[PDB]
């Protein structure tokens, strides 16, 4: 009677888990009694081994269909041997899941775009799922950042389940949270349009809380929602005085180093 | 404590209610493990991705190496580039500094026991067989929080109607459901640990926000620098009032609901004293003195060395001693010091019992060690600390058992709360040694340049245990990065001597009551704390 959720680990730091678990809208307990049927998640589920793969597989196989959200990166170099789980590879796993779900939500900008593991040199050959299963049909909706805003994954998700429109921009990731810019969300804003800038961070300009382009804030390349809808409902990065890293943007890892710098 | 005869292999392939990705094979005979190999199975390479980058960006880096263990890395990078810059930090990013790691302490434990542990020792169906008004009687008995019959009549409906649904989710499959001899607890304990874990769930949320306070955000916070810390937010009244308010609330989950529980999950295990011990121990201690980071020996408690469970002569911690061997993992080479770190891939196949991990085998003076709170507990103990000295002593009156229970997986899940509860309590003297030192000194950061030719080394002893990160810089970029971390310790695999690492070890023993369903080997690698994520980075 609950929607079935699938949530698959690739290769990833856990970072999107923890931020599902600080879903407040509504909490995560409410999540998965009332709302859905999470019925395979590494991190909190009671089986293990082939208890574990019998459940993943009976969810696959259910009837009402499943909704898959994956994190982390696909490792393809070595004949996709950097990682495997049950003896399985990474890449074998999801080639016959994902194209099987009712829908992919790719969560993390590993998952989206190839993450830290892809950034130079790339070792083990990391992609993204949209990239990796291209070929295959596989067409996930993009919810990025590193971690993602809890309330931008689950809102993603509710969006779904509700059978509401959701509106993709140029690297699929929803509009309705990541439809502008950091920057322009930003209540620094006013300080860069007056030139009024930190030139080092054990200054005057950076105690009175100036904008920090000057040491390296990428706010105006970087799409998310940070400064309006808040982390932890408390806190954002510039906030708290240090620049934003562009953690939502396709190859960051490169394009936005060094990051004190702009 | 049952036990089969069953005489054969055993894999465990995903260990789950971990982070990341593990495989466990055993051998067992009689019912009994005799051997164990304990496999990490991706890696990613983010020690080569840092070559020749930008020193200051290592911390962002590093950071993605895990996300349950948030903040850390960062912590560790921040204090590598610090060591080799060698000039002072001010005190109140020490101060900062030292109060987000303590809340990460109070959030990553709590999750750790209700969210990936409890599951290992508490029936959640035998939940629905207790006795609401028996439940919340046991509940007030062991707490000061009181509860009454109606709250878990209630939570035992709501429970009655997920399971009778047929949709168990991230209960289905348990190792418990048709009755399991290993799980031992009555229908009213296993109530009463269930309603907490859900109200766990909650409450982790609360404790998380306060590293937000400071830090930015959770996950991945973001207000360190070489040289401080970047929230001047952090010196206003309202944001250390707000802090101060979540972390009192954050105390009393973990001093009320945390703790007890643990304690009635030991008085119904008292078996598992037996099963799971190990003999050397190595911590690197923690929360440095304004003015002492660069000193170990500043730290509100020590590293240290314990061979054969020689706590009364706790030998002192040398850095130079250590060394990652490769014979086991799938790297190229031979045995290195971290400053001459490799990370060469040499992949043979999965299954393998040559090489058989993406962990290297890190070795403290030739010896293996286990790391984590079990081991810092041990250290403090052995250098006669305050607080936790006192606390074991009446954890171990409380159970009735002696010191010996203390080498065991019984001992390593308690030591883990036993953290948790000094931690949370010192908290309170930094905040307020915070408060009063921003009264005339408001610096938290100094703006240093990096060095064109340099090298340091960060230390931290974290949730799972030592990390420790190494770097080498010439002209100015990163010449080499690595790290060496708390579950690279104790889930890595045998040495270029044949012997194991810790986890490998202490599995041996263990006895086994259904090859099915082997509830023991998730107790013993459960109460390590694994992060694969980490460990192989
Ligand atoms: S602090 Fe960053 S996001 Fe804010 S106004 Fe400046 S450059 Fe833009
Ligand atoms: S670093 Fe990431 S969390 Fe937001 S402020 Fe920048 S996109
Ligand atoms: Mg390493
Ligand atoms: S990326
Ligand atoms: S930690």
Same mark, same amino acid.
């Given at each position: 009677?609950?929607?079935?959720? @699938?949530?698959?680990?690739?290769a /990833?730091?856990?970072?999107? *888990?923890?931020?599902?678990?600080?879903?407040?809208?509504?909490?995560?307990? &409410?999540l998965?009694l009332?709302? +859905? *049927?999470?019925?395979?998640?590494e991190?909190?589920?009671?089986?293990?081994?082939?208890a574990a793969?019998?459940?993943?597989?009976?969810?696959?196989?259910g009837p009402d269909?499943? +909704?898959?959200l994956?994190?982390?990166?696909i490792? &393809?170099?070595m004949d996709?041997?950097?990682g495997?789980?049950?003896?399985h590879?990474?890449?074998?796993?999801?080639?016959?899941?994902?194209?099987?779900?009712?829908?992919? @939500?790719? +969560?993390?900008?590993?998952?989206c775009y190839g993450?830290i593991?892809?950034?130079?040199?790339?070792?083990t050959?990391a992609?993204? +799922?949209?990239?990796?299963?291209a070929?295959?049909?596989?067409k996930?909706?993009?919810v990025? =950042?590193?971690?993602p805003?809890?309330?931008?994954?689950?809102?993603?998700?509710?969006?779904f389940?509700?059978?509401?429109?959701? /509106?993709?921009?140029?690297?699929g990731?929803? @509009?309705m949270?990541?439809?502008?810019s950091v920057?322009?969300?930003?209540?620094?804003?006013?300080?860069?349009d007056?030139?009024?800038?930190?030139?080092s961070?054990?200054?005057?300009?950076?105690?009175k =809380?100036?904008?920090?382009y000057? @040491?390296?804030?990428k706010?105006?390349?970087?799409?998310?929602?940070?400064?309006?809808?808040l982390?932890?409902?408390?806190?954002?990065?510039?906030?708290?005085?240090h620049?934003?890293?562009?953690?939502?943007?396709?190859?960051?890892?490169?394009?936005?180093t060094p990051?004190?710098?702009? | 404590?049952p036990?089969?005869n069953?005489?054969?292999?055993?894999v465990? !392939?995903?260990?789950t209610?971990?982070?990341?990705?593990?495989?466990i094979?055993?051998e067992?005979?009689?019912?009994?493990?005799?051997?164990?190999?304990?496999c990490?199975?991706?890696?990613?390479?983010?020690?080569?991705?840092l070559?020749?980058?930008?020193?200051?960006?290592?911390?962002? %880096?590093?950071?993605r190496?895990?996300?349950?263990?948030?903040?850390?890395?960062?912590?560790?990078?921040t204090?590598?580039?610090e060591?080799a810059?060698?000039?002072?930090?001010?005190?109140?990013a020490?101060?900062?500094?030292?109060?987000v790691?303590?809340?990460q302490f109070?959030?990553?434990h709590?999750?750790?026991?209700?969210?990936?542990?409890?599951?290992d020792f508490?029936?959640?169906t035998?939940?629905?067989?207790?006795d609401?008004?028996?439940a919340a009687?046991?509940?007030n008995?062991?707490?000061?929080?009181?509860?009454?019959?109606?709250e878990?009549?209630?939570?035992?409906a709501?429970?009655?109607?997920?399971?009778?649904?047929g949709?168990?989710?991230?209960?289905?499959?348990?190792y418990?459901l048709?009755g399991?001899?290993?799980?031992?607890?009555?229908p009213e304990?296993?109530?009463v640990?269930?309603?907490?874990?859900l109200?766990?769930?909650?409450?982790?949320?609360?404790?998380?926000?306060?590293?937000?306070?400071?830090?930015?955000?959770?996950?991945?916070?973001? %207000?360190?620098?070489?040289?401080?810390?970047?929230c001047?937010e952090?010196l206003?009244?309202?944001?250390?009032?707000?802090?101060?308010?979540?972390?009192?609330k954050?105390?009393?989950?973990?001093?009320?609901?945390?703790?007890p529980?643990?304690?009635?999950v030991?008085?119904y295990?008292k078996?598992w004293?037996?099963i799971?011990?190990?003999?050397?121990?190595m911590?690197?201690?923690?929360?440095?003195?304004?003015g002492?980071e660069?000193?170990?020996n500043?730290?509100?408690?020590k590293?240290?060395?314990?061979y054969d469970?020689?706590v009364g002569?706790?030998?002192?911690?040398?850095?130079?001693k250590?060394?990652?061997?490769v014979?086991?993992?799938w790297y190229?080479?031979?045995?290195?010091?971290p400053?001459?770190?490799?990370?060469?891939?040499?992949?043979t196949?999965?299954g393998?019992? !040559?090489?058989?991990?993406?962990?290297?085998?890190?070795?403290?003076?030739?010896?293996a060690?286990?790391?984590?709170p079990?081991a810092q507990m041990?250290?403090?103990?052995?250098?006669?600390?305050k607080?936790?000295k006192?606390?074991?002593?009446?954890?171990?009156?409380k159970?009735?058992?002696?010191?010996?229970?203390?080498?065991?997986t019984?001992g390593?899940?308690?030591?883990?709360?036993?953290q948790?509860?000094?931690?949370?309590?010192?908290?309170?003297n930094?905040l307020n040694?915070?408060e009063?030192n921003?009264?005339?000194?408001?610096?938290?950061?100094?703006?240093?340049?990096?060095?064109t030719?340099?090298?340091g080394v960060?230390?931290?002893?974290?949730?799972?245990?030592?990390?420790?990160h190494?770097?080498?810089?010439?002209?100015?970029?990163?010449?080499?990065?690595?790290?060496?971390?708390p579950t690279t310790?104790?889930?890595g695999?045998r040495d270029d001597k044949?012997?194991?690492?810790?986890?490998?070890?202490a599995?041996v023993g263990t006895?086994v009551?259904?090859?099915?369903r082997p509830?023991?080997?998730?107790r013993?690698?459960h109460?390590? !704390?694994?992060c694969?994520?980490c460990s192989?980075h």
């Amino acid at each position: 009677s609950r929607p079935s959720v @699938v949530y698959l680990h690739a290769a /990833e730091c856990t970072g999107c *888990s923890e931020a599902l678990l600080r879903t407040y809208q509504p909490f995560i307990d &409410t999540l998965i009694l009332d709302t +859905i *049927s999470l019925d395979y998640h590494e991190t909190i589920m009671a089986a293990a081994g082939e208890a574990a793969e019998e459940a993943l597989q009976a969810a696959v196989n259910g009837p009402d269909g499943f +909704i898959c959200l994956v994190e982390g990166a696909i490792p &393809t170099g070595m004949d996709n041997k950097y990682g495997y789980i049950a003896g399985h590879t990474m890449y074998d796993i999801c080639k016959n899941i994902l194209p099987k779900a009712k829908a992919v @939500v790719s +969560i993390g900008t590993c998952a989206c775009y190839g993450g830290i593991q892809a950034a130079k040199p790339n070792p083990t050959a990391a992609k993204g +799922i949209n990239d990796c299963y291209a070929d295959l049909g596989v067409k996930a909706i993009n919810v990025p =950042g590193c971690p993602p805003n809890p309330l931008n994954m689950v809102g993603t998700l509710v969006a779904f389940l509700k059978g509401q429109k959701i /509106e993709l921009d140029e690297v699929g990731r929803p @509009v309705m949270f990541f439809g502008q810019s950091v920057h322009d969300l930003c209540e620094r804003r006013k300080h860069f349009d007056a030139g009024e800038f930190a030139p080092s961070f054990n200054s005057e300009e950076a105690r009175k =809380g100036w904008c920090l382009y000057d @040491v390296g804030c990428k706010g105006p390349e970087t799409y998310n929602n940070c400064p309006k809808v808040l982390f932890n409902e408390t806190n954002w990065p510039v906030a708290a005085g240090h620049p934003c890293i562009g953690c939502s943007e396709p190859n960051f890892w490169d394009d936005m180093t060094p990051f004190y710098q702009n | 404590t049952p036990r089969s005869n069953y005489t054969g292999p055993i894999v465990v !392939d995903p260990l789950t209610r971990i982070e990341g990705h593990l495989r466990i094979e055993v051998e067992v005979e009689g019912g009994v493990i005799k051997e164990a190999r304990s496999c990490a199975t991706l890696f990613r390479g983010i020690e080569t991705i840092l070559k020749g980058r930008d020193p200051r960006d290592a911390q962002h %880096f590093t950071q993605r190496t895990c996300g349950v263990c948030t903040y850390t890395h960062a912590l560790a990078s921040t204090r590598c580039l610090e060591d080799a810059i060698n000039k002072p930090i001010p005190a109140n990013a020490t101060y900062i500094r030292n109060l987000v790691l303590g809340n990460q302490f109070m959030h990553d434990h709590l999750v750790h026991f209700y969210h990936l542990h409890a599951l290992d020792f508490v029936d959640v169906t035998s939940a629905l067989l207790a006795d609401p008004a028996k439940a919340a009687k046991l509940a007030n008995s062991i707490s000061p929080r009181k509860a009454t019959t109606e709250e878990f009549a209630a939570v035992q409906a709501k429970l009655k109607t997920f399971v009778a649904s047929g949709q168990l989710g991230p209960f289905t499959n348990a190792y418990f459901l048709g009755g399991h001899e290993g799980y031992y607890m009555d229908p009213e304990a296993n109530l009463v640990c269930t309603a907490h874990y859900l109200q766990a769930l909650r409450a982790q949320v609360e404790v998380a926000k306060g590293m937000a306070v400071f830090g930015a955000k959770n996950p991945h916070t973001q %207000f360190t620098v070489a040289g401080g810390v970047t929230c001047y937010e952090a010196l206003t009244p309202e944001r250390i009032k707000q802090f101060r308010e979540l972390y009192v609330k954050a105390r009393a989950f973990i001093e009320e609901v945390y703790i007890p529980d643990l304690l009635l999950v030991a008085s119904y295990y008292k078996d598992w004293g037996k099963i799971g011990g190990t003999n050397n121990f190595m911590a690197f201690g923690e929360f440095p003195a304004p003015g002492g980071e660069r000193d170990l020996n500043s730290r509100w408690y020590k590293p240290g060395v314990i061979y054969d469970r020689k706590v009364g002569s706790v030998q002192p911690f040398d850095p130079s001693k250590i060394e990652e061997h490769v014979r086991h993992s799938w790297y190229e080479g031979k045995a290195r010091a971290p400053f001459e770190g490799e990370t060469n891939p040499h992949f043979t196949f999965m299954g393998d019992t !040559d090489k058989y991990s993406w962990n290297k085998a890190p070795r403290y003076d030739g010896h293996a060690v286990e790391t984590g709170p079990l081991a810092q507990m041990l250290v403090a103990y052995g250098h006669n600390h305050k607080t936790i000295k006192p606390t074991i002593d009446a954890v171990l009156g409380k159970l009735n058992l002696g010191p010996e229970a203390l080498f065991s997986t019984l001992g390593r899940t308690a030591a883990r709360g036993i953290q948790t509860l000094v931690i949370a309590q010192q908290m309170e003297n930094w905040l307020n040694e915070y408060e009063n030192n921003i009264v005339k000194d408001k610096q938290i950061v100094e703006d240093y340049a990096v060095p064109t030719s340099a090298r340091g080394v960060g230390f931290a002893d974290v949730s799972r245990g030592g990390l420790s990160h190494w770097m080498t810089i010439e002209d100015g970029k990163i010449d080499n990065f690595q790290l060496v971390v708390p579950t690279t310790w104790n889930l890595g695999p045998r040495d270029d001597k044949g012997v194991p690492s810790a986890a490998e070890a202490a599995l041996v023993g263990t006895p086994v009551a259904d090859p099915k369903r082997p509830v023991e080997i998730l107790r013993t690698i459960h109460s390590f !704390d694994p992060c694969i994520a980490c460990s192989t980075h």
